[PDB]
Structure 1
Amino acid sequence: KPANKLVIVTEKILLKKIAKIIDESGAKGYTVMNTGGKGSRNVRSSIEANIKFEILTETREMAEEIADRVAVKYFNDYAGIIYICSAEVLYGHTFAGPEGASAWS
């Protein structure tokens, strides 16, 4: 089943702030990694101080909503880039099926 994989590479200090935006979007979760890096926007600069989020979204609209909120709220003032990859989910939130009367477990 196709899904958008939204990636946000940004400053570590934004971790909780971005996790709240992701949650508010309706996305079921996110994965976050510590990283290093170098950029050319030269907002932060010309240890690892980055974080990388990967968020598998329900729709393209969901991914765009997260992206647009993060970028508008933070990217004039903080380093970061955002991009999307195409993914196909094999086992996701629905691993054990729906809840309620259509449940199979």
Structure 2
Amino acid sequence: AKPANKLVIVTEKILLKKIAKIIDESGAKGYTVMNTGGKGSRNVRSSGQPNTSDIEANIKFEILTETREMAEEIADRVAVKYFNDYAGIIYICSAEVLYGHTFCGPEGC
């Protein structure tokens, strides 16, 4: 029962290497990535594979931070750098972490 903020970044698949660098620079303890599909305004993709077989051409990042101010600092760094040229959405929900060794610490939560 330790309160957290769940930041979600949905963007193009090509930015997997660059956004995982930004998360590791901000002091976040980890992240989770999925390959997803979806539709929006900038729907054209180029992933290095054939587009006709590229049904899931997005990534969904999921970052749990202890503070709200850290999760807005990752989102400000991603959206300034890439969201003028790449497709993307960033939203944040509120969660509570029950277990986890690097989040709650060795003391526990």
TM above 0.5, yes or no, is yes
Residue 31 (structure 2) pairs with residue 23 (structure 1)? no
| Contact persistence 1:32–1:53 (CA under 8 A) | yes
Q: RMSD value over aligned CA atoms?
A: 3.0
Shift of 1:95: 7.4
Moved more, 82-91 or 46-55: 46-55
Moved more, 88-97 or 27-36: 88-97
TM-score (norm 2): 0.81
Q: How many residues align?
A: 100
Give percent identity, aligned residues only: 99
Give the corresponding residue for 2:77: 69
TM-score (norm 1): 0.84
Separation in structure 2 between the aligned mates of residue 22 and residue 80 of structure 1, nearest angstrom: 16
| Contact persistence 1:9–1:80 (CA under 8 A) | yes
Higher RCO, 1 vs 2 (CA within 8 Å, ≥6 residues apart) = 2
Residue 62 (structure 2) pairs with residue 54 (structure 1)? yes
Structure 2: which 5+ runs fail to align? 48-54
